[PDB]
Structure 1
Amino acid sequence: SIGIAVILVGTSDEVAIKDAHEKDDFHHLSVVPRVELVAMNETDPKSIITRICDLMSDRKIQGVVFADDTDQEAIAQILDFISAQTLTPILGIHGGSSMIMADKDESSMFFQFGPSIEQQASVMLNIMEEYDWYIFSIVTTYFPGYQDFVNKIRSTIENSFVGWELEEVLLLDMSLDDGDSKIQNQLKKLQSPIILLYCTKEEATYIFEVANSVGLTGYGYTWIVPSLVAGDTDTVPAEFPTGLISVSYDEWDYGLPARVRDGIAIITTAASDMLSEHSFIPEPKSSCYNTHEKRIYQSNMLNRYLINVTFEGRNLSFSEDGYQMHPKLVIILLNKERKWERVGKWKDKSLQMKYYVWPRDHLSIVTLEEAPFVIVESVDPLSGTCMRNTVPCQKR
């Protein structure tokens, strides 16, 4: 008896998604997942509000599911604003709706399928743990999320028994006018094999170009950047060094039809427990007229249920801010040409990297365990890595 508006913007596989609606079986929850599927290609703010508002009073849909393909971030803003006033859950499955906003409205019920900067920062260290990388030289800019990126890295460094060496936290300001030298001299302090860059994709080229003027972008180093720096993996600004590593959301395996089924399941699973535990059905005034007096009825009891939702053994739980607790994060690496290729995947703090050794003097050495000459032992249960006076050695 609950209707969800699966809104799609632009060209997308609507037919394939509609197939999953029939296969969506939730008889255990005993809630009928009505789907108000609609298709449209005008992502302008007027159309998206008037489409939701018109469908609000059409059949009193409790929740809204949104999908998109544009790279603009303004859609996630309006959906958060819409969900705040209407008090109706909105899921940012695809496109600009999945672009995570650090701060949302207090009353907003907008949840997004994406990782946080802190989640991507911790994944950056996991790939540095696998290959025994213990140098950081974090380079950031004045982007709003730069504090949470550094704080998570610093918090993880000082709360772990692994030996992490942070060299510098070089910070650059892009607001200077004719200040190319001011930024350039700041980067001259780099003396490390790894730089954890955090900046806009446009600002990344400027930093890379300044490093290109220095020339020490990458020859035996490695630069690790979040999905924000990579942006659209289809286009490369040709200044990104070969070997760039990015922690991007799973846009390849996690296709849009699969997301809609999970997105629909999230709303009904949370809603099913709301009508059974609290014995209250969410039926607010769906009209948009005089929204000031429409705030008397509160649907915030459903927020505690949308936060904790499980489906098919997968913890599809959203954080308080709105992002996923357990996202399907993959790692993309620049190829020999200018193409991004998946190297590994991350799920539940587990890194299933497909590379046993990182490719790039370096020479392989054989070894046999015998006598005090070579003694092999398992990894340290306490530190988690090779102990003092010990080096790693693989085995087939």
Structure 2
Amino acid sequence: PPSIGIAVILVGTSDEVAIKDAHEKDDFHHLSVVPRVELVAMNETDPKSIITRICDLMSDRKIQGVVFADDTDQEAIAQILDFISAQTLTPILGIHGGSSMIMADKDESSMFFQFGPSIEQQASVMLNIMEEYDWYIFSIVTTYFPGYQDFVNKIRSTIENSFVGWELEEVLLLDSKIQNQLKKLQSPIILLYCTKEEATYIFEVANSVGLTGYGYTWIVPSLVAGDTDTVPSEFPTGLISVSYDEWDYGLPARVRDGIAIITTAASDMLSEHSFIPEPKSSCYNTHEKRIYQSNMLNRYLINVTFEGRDLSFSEDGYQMHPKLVIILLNKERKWERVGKWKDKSLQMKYYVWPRQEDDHLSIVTLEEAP
């Protein structure tokens, strides 16, 4: 079993000795090829540094694959990872930070990926939680951030099969007129699609709105949640945002996901096709022979199961069976873990949401017809 180079990019604070337990730990004899691990830490946030040390991973060492993770949520470096990745024409997936955060409009020639659900799949999880919310009052207010008409018609798509009359109040394309236009808000849930910095001033106009008070709900996305440790004081109190795990899912376990998905990505290809790619000639010198890449391997690499859980990356790059966590902010000034959502499947801590005006009317009974 040949050991092919794999670039593992550890950004920020990380455990290298433990990274040997997340990389060097073992190799699976079920495969006709072996992993070859490359682990270093370059903490620079400049993309030309990603080009530097990555093009060094190709230049000095010889890598058939690569992996990286981010120490922050800035996705410009991810856009880099796309551009230079396809420039290298090799797949990779962000395991942490903005690297794990996907961006819109994945490059066609790019075989790279990331760890996370689709914004579509994200909203789907938001719907499973809507079931967990057991609330019929919804609405749509969101900005020009990516997926605008997309996630619009995607909301209309998620409720497009809805038989129940659960009310989605209105659609709002966000842009003084903030609260002036937004005052029509009715439904108990507060849900929006925009950036997190966009959510800072949006949340400022939300405190300016005051409609966020108790007896109402607030929904936000995984990336919209951003850093759990980062709480803008203007966001809704204990706001409910499910996300991919910022705690539970191991980033070194994500390293097992990367190197693993690389190996299994070589499983059937090396098996039948018996084709593994060579390392790129050079960042300068790989331009001509670059025609030697084809779409079969990654296409063959599509269907996969990581640690038994489906590892297939979506044609858009998301995970076939992504592991998402039901989550919310708390009133303790911390993000409260509200559960986990595995595809349609989901879990939570309690049988009720976090919960003048009366609470509710029990009025217990038993059905007696008529």
Q: What TM-score comes out, normalization by structure 2 length?
A: 0.91
Say if 1:112 and 1:323, in contact at 8 Å, map to a contact too. yes
Q: Distance in 1 between matches of 2:143 and 2:206?
A: 15
Say if 2:206 and 2:234, in contact at 8 Å, map to a contact too. no
Where 1:352 maps in the other structure, the secondary structure is: strand
What's the C-alpha RMSD, in Å, of the aligned pairs? Answer: 2.0
**Which stretch shifts more, 194-203 or 348-357?**
194-203
The alpha carbon displacement at 1:8 in A equals: 1.2
Say if 1:344 and 1:354, in contact at 8 Å, map to a contact too. yes
Gapped regions of structure 2 (runs ≥ 5): none
Where 2:36 maps in the other structure, the secondary structure is: strand
Gapped regions of structure 1 (runs ≥ 5): 173-179, 372-396
Where 1:283 maps in the other structure, the secondary structure is: coil
The alpha carbon displacement at 1:59 in A equals: 3.8
Say if 2:95 and 2:115, in contact at 8 Å, map to a contact too. yes
Say if 1:14 and 1:39, in contact at 8 Å, map to a contact too. no
Provide, for residues 27-86 of structure 1, a one-character-per-residue CA deviation record: whole Å limited to 9, x for no partner: 111211111222332232232212122221434210011122123212111111111111
Q: Would you say 1:358 and 2:350 are equivalent positions?
A: no
Partner of 2:326: 331
Say if 2:324 and 2:343, in contact at 8 Å, map to a contact too. no
Q: 1:213 to 1:85 in 2, by over 3 A?
A: closer
The alpha carbon displacement at 1:218 in A equals: 2.3
Provide, for residues 156-201 of structure 1, a one-character-per-residue CA deviation record: whole Å limited to 9, x for no partner: 11123333322101222xxxxxxx9322221121122223222222
Bigger CA radius of gyration: 1
Say if 2:125 and 2:343, in contact at 8 Å, map to a contact too. no
Identity %: 99
Q: 1:362 to 1:226 in 2, by over 3 A?
A: same
Q: Would you say 1:255 and 2:250 are equivalent positions?
A: yes
The alpha carbon displacement at 1:154 in A equals: 0.8
Q: 1:281 to 1:231 in 2, by over 3 A?
A: closer
Say if 1:282 and 1:299, in contact at 8 Å, map to a contact too. no
Partner of 1:126: 128
Where 1:36 maps in the other structure, the secondary structure is: strand
Q: Distance in 2 between matches of 1:289 and 1:211?
A: 50
The alpha carbon displacement at 1:363 in A equals: 4.3
Say if 1:66 and 1:93, in contact at 8 Å, map to a contact too. yes
Partner of 2:48: 46
Q: 1:284 to 1:333 in 2, by over 3 A?
A: closer
Q: Would you say 1:185 and 2:187 are equivalent positions?
A: no
Question: How many residues align structurally?
Answer: 364
Q: Distance in 1 between matches of 2:38 and 2:197?
A: 39
**Which stretch shifts more, 278-287 or 63-72?**
278-287
Where 2:82 maps in the other structure, the secondary structure is: helix
Q: 1:307 to 1:218 in 2, by over 3 A?
A: farther
Say if 1:9 and 1:43, in contact at 8 Å, map to a contact too. no
The alpha carbon displacement at 1:342 in A equals: 0.5
Q: 1:96 to 1:181 in 2, by over 3 A?
A: closer
Q: Distance in 1 between matches of 2:110 and 2:350?
A: 42
**Which stretch shifts more, 183-192 or 26-35?**
183-192
The alpha carbon displacement at 1:269 in A equals: 0.8
Say if 2:326 and 2:347, in contact at 8 Å, map to a contact too. no
The alpha carbon displacement at 1:290 in A equals: 4.2
Q: 1:214 to 1:93 in 2, by over 3 A?
A: closer
The alpha carbon displacement at 1:151 in A equals: 1.9
The alpha carbon displacement at 1:5 in A equals: 1.5
Q: Distance in 2 between matches of 1:315 and 1:291?
A: 34
Provide, for residues 58-117 of structure 1, a one-character-per-residue CA deviation record: whole Å limited to 9, x for no partner: 342100111221232121111111111111222211222111011122111211001221
